[PDB]
A and B are shown apart, each in its own frame.
With several copies, the nearest count.
Chain A
Amino acid sequence: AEANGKITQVIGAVVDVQFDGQLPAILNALETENNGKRLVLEVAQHLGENTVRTIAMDATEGLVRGLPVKDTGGPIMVPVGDATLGRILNVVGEPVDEGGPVEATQTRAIHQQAPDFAAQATASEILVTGIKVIDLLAPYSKGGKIGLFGGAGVGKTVLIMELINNIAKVHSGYSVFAGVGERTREGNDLYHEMVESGVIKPDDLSKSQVALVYGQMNEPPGARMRVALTGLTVAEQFRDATGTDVLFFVDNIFRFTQAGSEVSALLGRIPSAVGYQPTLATDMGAMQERITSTKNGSITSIQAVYVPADDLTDPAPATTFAHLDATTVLSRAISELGIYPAVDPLDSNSRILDPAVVGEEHYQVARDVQGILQKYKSLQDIIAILGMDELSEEDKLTVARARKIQRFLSQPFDVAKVFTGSDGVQVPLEDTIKSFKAVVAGEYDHLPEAAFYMVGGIEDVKAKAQRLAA
């Protein structure tokens, strides 16, 4: 046995423990004894009088004042390596797939320093996704940070599932998925989807190329506040200990911040604006700065980002924009039109959208698409009163192309077949640029709008128009 403490207070997820000798440092993991199962507590503060404040990683029902608590003498340690692949872990590294222990040869702390400034990689290369709006307007970067913003039910999860399908399945390094404070039902769905794609194999767990970590809405706030760390900790091992390219998918990183705010008050913090913890930015920074490519190896991170009440100025999503290399913003106004993916072409960006990186062809077409759309948007107020008849032949020629382009941005997702009743499509980058270039040039002003809706490449538009003739 280790040094022993005694529980002095229990208020929801916050537990105070007293140590007669040896006081465990901030972030250390304590094991509470005398329970149905092992309960882990994370040290958050030293209150004084040899007492520490902690957050529980599981329910605190059953705890009693005076129960003994053991300091493990370090932060939460979780399994890393080949042994995690095809398995499902929780925030504290325990298996939750009913498949037995993860007998790994190494473990790693879920709290770690972020890579040094000299260790950053400056190389900028595209990762083509096959999704026309993304690849065109705000392309993702290999080893870059990607964020998918969306209010409730606009399609950020469907988008991340599609990206796993197009990126991870087509070319696997190793992958890590972190389910963070989301739907347990969604965890079962993802799991069976990955079995079908063979990305997870139940027979050779060695042939699995994805590790799964989950702390969903059924878990208390302490666990939802740290599952993100657990997931990225697994990813870091693949980056450093094997170098090879690593994918990290997170649904949803908002929940990290929300969890924190659930217990902030009981940790004795003065609230910040909108009831968020005053440590929002630094909490977020020390996590996010670990999710990065370095000279040692690459991590390509894709994170779904919840937007409360569809307000992107909300502190959580608002502080997230600064940690990204590519932002894909989803809009309800667009979803409402049947336009999927509901990506806002006038509110999505990428730091690689530069003619020196993607070529002037890619740059100018994207820029041309955005220009005709902002011009339509400025025009919308006028036609809302006068109708279209009052516009000039040029003013309405932009209206017609704009609406075509908006439709040509929509796309049948393979993951979405259960909704559309149509087969998914994947469009190569070159084909995207070409296609969109032609429409902006006017080379399709004779085709009908409907021909542009829910298709792949511009050939399909022409072919749909043909199948629309008869």
Chain B
Amino acid sequence: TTFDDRERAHEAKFAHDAELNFKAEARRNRLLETIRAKMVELRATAREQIISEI
């Protein structure tokens, strides 16, 4: 392209956020009215957990 830099930086980023959200799924799975509840409760929880490694 012309913006070959932005091009790659973008693909790499949105691939990271894809993979990172799969990791967040694995977090919420590792944590599991009530089925629906927990799936929300630990969507949000697992997302904070991931943004926090030590």
Name the segment of A147-155, A157-165, A378-386, A416-424 touching the other chain.
A378-386
Contact A383 B7 (CB under 8 A): yes
B residues within 8 A CB of A388? 10-11, 14
Asked if A315 CB lies within 8 Å of chain B CBs, one says no
Selected from B3, B7, B22, the residue in CB contact (under 8 A) with A448 is B22
B residues within 8 A CB of A450? 19
Asked if B31 CB lies within 8 Å of chain A CBs, one says no
Contact A469 B26 (CB under 8 A): yes
Contact A384 B3 (CB under 8 A): yes
Asked if A268 CB lies within 8 Å of chain B CBs, one says no
Q: A448-B18, A449-B15 are in contact. Are A384 and B7 (CB under 8 A)?
A: yes
Residue of chain A at shortest CB distance from B30: A469
Asked if B52 CB lies within 8 Å of chain A CBs, one says no
B residues within 8 A CB of A382? 3, 5-6
Asked if B33 CB lies within 8 Å of chain A CBs, one says no
Asked if B53 CB lies within 8 Å of chain A CBs, one says no
Q: A382-B6, A448-B19 are in contact. Are A387 and B1 (CB under 8 A)?
A: no
Contact A380 B7 (CB under 8 A): yes
Contact A387 B2 (CB under 8 A): no
Asked if A427 CB lies within 8 Å of chain B CBs, one says no
A residues within 8 A CB of B3? 381-382, 384-385
B residues within 8 A CB of A448? 18-19, 22
B residues within 8 A CB of A447? 22
Contact B10 A384 (CB under 8 A): yes
Contact B1 A380 (CB under 8 A): yes
Q: How far is the CB of A389 from chain B (nearest CB, A)?
A: 8
Q: Which of A425-469 contact B (CB under 8 A)?
A: 446-450, 469
Contact B2 A381 (CB under 8 A): yes
Contact A385 B6 (CB under 8 A): yes
B residues within 8 A CB of A380? 1, 7, 11
A residues within 8 A CB of B19? 448-450
Chain A count of residues within 8 A CB distance of the other chain: 17
Q: A381-B1, A384-B1 are in contact. Are A449 and B7 (CB under 8 A)?
A: no
Asked if A39 CB lies within 8 Å of chain B CBs, one says no
B residues within 8 A CB of A400? 18
Asked if A403 CB lies within 8 Å of chain B CBs, one says yes
Contact B4 A384 (CB under 8 A): yes
A residues within 8 A CB of B18? 400, 448-449
Residue of chain B at shortest CB distance from A469: B26
Q: A448-B22, A469-B26 are in contact. Are A387 and B14 (CB under 8 A)?
A: yes
Q: Which of A114-134 contact B (CB under 8 A)?
A: none
Residue of chain A at shortest CB distance from B16: A449
Interface centre among A388, A446, A447 (most CB of B within 10 A): A388
Q: How far is the CB of B54 from chain A (nearest CB, A)?
A: 17
B residues within 8 A CB of A389? 14
B residues within 8 A CB of A381? 1-3
Contact B1 A403 (CB under 8 A): no
A residues within 8 A CB of B22? 446-448
Bitwise, A301-336 to B at CB < 8 A (1) or not (0) is 000000000000000000000000000000000000
Interface centre among A381, A382, A385, A448 (most CB of B within 10 A): A448
Contact A383 B2 (CB under 8 A): no
Q: A448-B22, A449-B19 are in contact. Are A403 and B11 (CB under 8 A)?
A: yes
Q: Which of A373-406 contact B (CB under 8 A)?
A: 380-385, 387-389, 400, 403
Could you name 20 residue pairs across A and B whose Cβ atoms are closer than 8 Å?
Answer: A380-B1, A382-B3, A382-B6, A383-B7, A383-B11, A384-B3, A384-B4, A385-B2, A385-B6, A387-B13, A387-B14, A388-B10, A388-B14, A389-B14, A400-B18, A403-B15, A446-B22, A447-B22, A448-B19, A449-B19
**Which are the 7 A-B pairs with shortest beta-carbon distances?**
A384-B7, A388-B14, A448-B19, A448-B22, A384-B1, A387-B10, A384-B3
Given contacts A380-B7, A385-B2, A389-B14, 12 further A-B pairs with CB under 8 A are: A381-B2, A381-B3, A382-B6, A383-B7, A383-B10, A384-B1, A384-B7, A385-B6, A403-B15, A446-B22, A448-B19, A450-B19
